[PDB]
C-alpha cells in the first residue's frame, strides 16, 4: 500500500476510517490503500 | 443508535435467565451460551427485552448498540442457521473428510489437517464443498477463515478456497 | 537417563565393522555409589549424588587427603559405603536409584549414543594476547609490532576501557563440555566405556558422562 | 524542623498545619511562635486546648 503523509479520497468507492489512531483509507480497489493520515 | 431500539423478540420457545450480570441460554438446538452485560438495564417483561439507555458521553452510547446485538444473535442463534458454505476452485483439488478432522489436499507437498471445536459441526458435500455448522457466531466466523487461509483465491486462475457469494478478482496473465 | 563418573586413561582407535576407523577415548569407571537422594520432600530440588574411587577409612595422625576425616565419614555411613574421593551430583534422573547406596552400573550405556562429557580443561597457563584469544600479529620484517595487542579502546571521547576487553591472563582450567558424542564399546571386568572422540581433560582427569539434552 | 513537628501534631487531631497557623493568628492573638512546639512534645493535654481555640473562631 501507499504509506504517505497525506491521505485523500481518490474516487467514490474509497472511504476514510481511523484504526489504532491512524487515518486509513480502505477501498475496494487494491491500489487505493492509504494510511499515515 | 437506531440499532439501540429494536427488541430481542423472544419467540416463546427460548430460555433466558439473567444470572446476575450474565445470560444463560437454552434452546432446541444448542444450549448453555454464557456471556456478559456490563451495566445496561434489561427489562424482560413478557418474551421481549427492551434495553434502557443512559445519557451522553458516547461510552454510554457505543456500548448500547453492542450489548443488544450480542444477545439478539444468541436468541436468533440457538434456533436458526448460519451462512457457512465454502467452495474450492481448480484442478486436482479435493476436500476429503476423515472423521471430524478435515484434510485438504490443496496443492502442497503435505495435506493440511484441521481440528474441530465444541458445539460446531463439520460436513463435506460431494467432493469440494465444506460446510461449518455451529452455534457460536465467532466460531463459525473464525473457522471459515482458518480453512480459507490455507490457500486464498488467486487473481489469475481462481484456484484456492473462496466463499459463496463473493467475487474474486480477475486479470489477464498475457 | 543418568550418568557415571570416569577417570580418563588415554586415546587409541578401534575399527568399525564396515571398514571405518573410529578414534576413541578410554574412560574407566570403577566403584560408583549413590550416596544420598535430595528430594522435594525435604528442602530443594530433585537429584541424586554419586561418588567415585573410594579412600581409606580414618587415622589418628591423619596427615593429608588420603584418609577420610570425621565429617566426610558419617556422610558415607548412612549410605553404608566406603568414603569416596570425588563426589559429584546429577539432576534430571529417575528415582530408580535407592537412597541407600547401590552401585551404579557401567552396563547402562550399551547403545546410548547421546553423551555429554563434562571435563575440566587442560589448564595451559601459558598466557599471552595471541595464544589465548587467537589474535593476529604484525609484520616481523617491515615494522615492529611483533606480538602484542593493539588499541585497548577507542580514544578520548570514551576515556575508559570497556569492561570485557581481551588482555593476557591465566589460560585454561575453565570447565567445558562437549556434546553429542557416541559410545563404541562398553566392558565388564575392566569397567571401561569407549566414548568416541576426544574428551576435555588431562590424563588421570575426571569426566561426567551424562545423557544429552538436545 | 519546628514546622515539621507541628505538622506532625495537628494531623493526628485531623487538621492541617496551614489550618493551624491560620487560626492562631485569627481566632486568638496567640503570639507567633514555632520554637514553642515544645508544648506538643511535653504536654499533649496542653496542646489540645489550643486546637480547640483555633477551630472555635475559624
Amino acid at each position: 500500500m501507499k504509506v504517505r503523509p497525506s491521505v485523500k479520497p481518490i474516487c467514490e468507492k474509497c472511504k476514510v476510517i481511523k484504526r489504532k489512531g491512524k487515518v486509513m483509507v480502505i477501498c475496494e480497489n487494491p491500489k487505493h490503500k492509504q494510511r499515515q493520515g | 443508535s437506531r440499532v439501540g431500539k429494536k427488541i430481542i423478540d423472544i419467540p416463546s420457545d427460548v430460555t433466558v435467565t439473567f444470572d446476575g450480570n450474565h445470560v444463560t441460554v437454552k434452546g432446541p438446538k444448542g444450549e448453555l451460551s454464557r456471556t456478559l452485560n456490563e451495566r445496561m438495564t434489561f427489562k424482560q417483561e413478557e418474551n421481549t427485552i427492551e434495553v434502557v439507555r443512559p445519557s451522553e458521553s458516547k461510552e454510554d452510547r457505543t456500548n448500547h448498540g453492542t450489548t443488544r446485538a450480542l444477545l439478539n444473535n444468541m436468541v436468533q442463534g440457538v434456533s436458526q442457521g448460519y451462512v457457512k458454505v465454502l467452495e474450492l476452485v481448480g484442478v486436482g483439488y479435493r476436500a476429503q473428510m476423515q472423521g471430524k478432522d478435515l484434510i485438504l489436499n490443496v496443492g502442497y507437498s503435505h495435506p493440511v489437517e484441521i481440528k474441530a471445536e465444541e458445539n460446531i459441526t463439520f460436513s463435506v458435500e460431494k467432493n469440494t464443498v465444506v460446510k461449518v455448522e455451529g452455534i457460536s457466531k465467532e466460531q463459525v466466523g473464525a473457522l471459515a477463515s482458518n480453512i480459507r487461509s490455507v490457500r486464498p483465491p488467486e487473481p489469475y486462475k481462481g484456484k484456492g478456497i473462496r466463499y459463496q457469494g463473493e467475487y474474486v478478482r480477475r486479470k489477464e496473465g498475457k | 537417563t543418568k550418568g557415571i563418573l570416569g577417570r580418563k586413561i588415554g586415546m587409541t582407535q578401534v575399527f568399525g565393522e564396515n571398514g571405518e576407523l573410529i578414534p576413541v577415548t578410554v574412560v574407566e569407571a570403577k566403584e560408583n555409589v549413590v550416596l544420598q537422594k535430595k528430594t522435594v520432600e525435604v528442602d530443594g530440588y530433585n537429584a541424586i549424588q554419586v561418588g567415585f574411587e573410594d579412600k581409606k577409612a580414618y587415622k589418628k595422625d591423619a596427615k593429608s587427603n588420603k584418609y577420610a576425616n570425621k565429617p566426610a565419614e558419617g556422610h558415607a555411613k548412612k549410605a553404608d559405603a566406603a568414603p569416596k574421593r570425588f563426589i559429584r551430583e546429577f539432576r534430571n534422573v529417575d528415582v530408580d536409584a535407592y537412597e541407600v547406596g547401590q552401585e551404579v552400573s557401567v552396563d547402562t550405556f550399551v547403545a546410548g549414543d547421546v553423551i555429554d562429557v563434562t571435563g575440566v580443561s587442560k589448564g595451559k597457563g601459558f598466557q599471552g594476547a595471541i595464544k589465548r584469544h587467537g589474535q593476529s600479529r604484525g609484520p616481523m620484517s617491515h615494522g615492529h609490532f611483533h606480538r602484542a595487542p593493539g588499541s585497548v579502546g577507542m580514544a578520548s571521547d570514551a576515556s575508559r576501557v570497556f569492561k570485557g576487553q581481551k588482555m593476557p591472563g591465566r589460560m585454561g582450567g575453565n570447565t567445558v563440555t562437549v556434546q553429542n558424542l557416541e559410545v563404541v564399546q562398553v566392558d565388564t571386568e575392566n569397567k571401561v566405556i569407549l566414548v568416541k572422540g576426544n574428551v576435555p581433560g588431562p590424563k588421570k582427569g575426571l569426566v561426567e558422562i551424562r545423557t544429552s539434552i538436545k | 524542623l519546628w514546622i515539621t513537628r507541628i505538622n506532625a501534631a495537628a494531623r493526628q487531631h485531623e487538621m492541617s498545619y496551614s489550618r493551624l497557623m491560620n487560626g492562631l493568628k485569627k481566632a486568638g492573638i496567640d503570639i507567633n511562635r514555632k520554637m514553642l512546639s515544645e508544648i506538643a512534645i511535653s504536654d499533649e493535654k496542653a496542646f489540645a486546648q489550643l486546637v480547640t481555640k483555633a477551630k472555635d473562631a475559624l
Binding site: - | - | 570497556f162 569492561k163 570485557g164 | 513537628r5 494531623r11 493526628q12 520554637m35 512546639s37 506538643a40
Partner: protein
C-alpha cells in the same frame, strides 16, 4: 536551647501492615515513604532512625491508569558495552510483583547513608500471608 533531639534509646518503632489491594502504585508509595521516614510522629528529628516498620501484602492487585501497563519501561544497564535491558510494567506485575512496589518506594528516600537503613524497614510480599506474625503488626488505614 530548649529543643529536643530523640536518640538511640529514647524512641520505639512499632509495626504496620498495609493491604495494598485495589489502589494505584504511586499514590500508595507516598503513605509508605513517609512512614519509613517518620513524619507521622512528633519527636521527629533528622539524623536518627525514627519511623515505623511497614509490611505490604497483596502486591498482585495494584493498579495502572492509561497504557502504563504497556508503555512504562524499566531500563537498566550492566556496565559491559551494549547492555541496556528493558522490562515493562505489565510483565512485571505477573512475573515478580515483589520488586515492582519495592522500587516505587525506594525512589522517594533520601541521601543514601541513612536512606539505605530507612528503606530496609520495608517488607514486600506477593500473596496474602506473611511470616511476621511474631512481631504483632496492625492495620493502617492510609488516606
Amino acid at each position: 536551647r530548649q529543643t529536643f533531639m530523640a536518640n538511640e534509646s529514647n524512641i520505639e518503632r512499632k509495626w504496620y501492615v498495609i493491604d495494598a489491594e485495589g489502589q494505584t502504585l504511586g499514590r500508595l508509595s507516598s503513605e509508605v515513604a513517609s512512614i519509613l521516614r517518620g513524619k507521622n510522629k512528633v519527636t521527629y528529628t533528622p539524623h536518627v532512625d525514627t519511623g515505623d516498620y511497614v509490611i505490604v501484602i497483596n502486591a498482585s492487585k495494584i493498579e495502572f491508569t492509561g497504557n502504563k501497563e504497556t508503555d512504562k519501561v524499566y531500563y537498566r544497564h550492566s556496565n559491559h558495552p551494549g547492555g541496556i535491558k528493558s522490562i515493562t510494567a505489565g510483565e512485571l506485575r505477573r512475573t515478580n510483583p515483589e520488586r515492582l512496589i519495592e522500587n516505587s518506594i525506594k525512589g522517594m528516600l533520601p541521601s543514601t547513608r541513612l536512606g539505605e537503613k530507612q528503606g530496609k524497614k520495608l517488607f514486600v510480599y506477593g500473596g496474602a500471608e506473611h511470616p511476621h506474625a511474631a512481631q504483632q503488626p496492625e492495620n493502617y488505614e492510609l488516606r
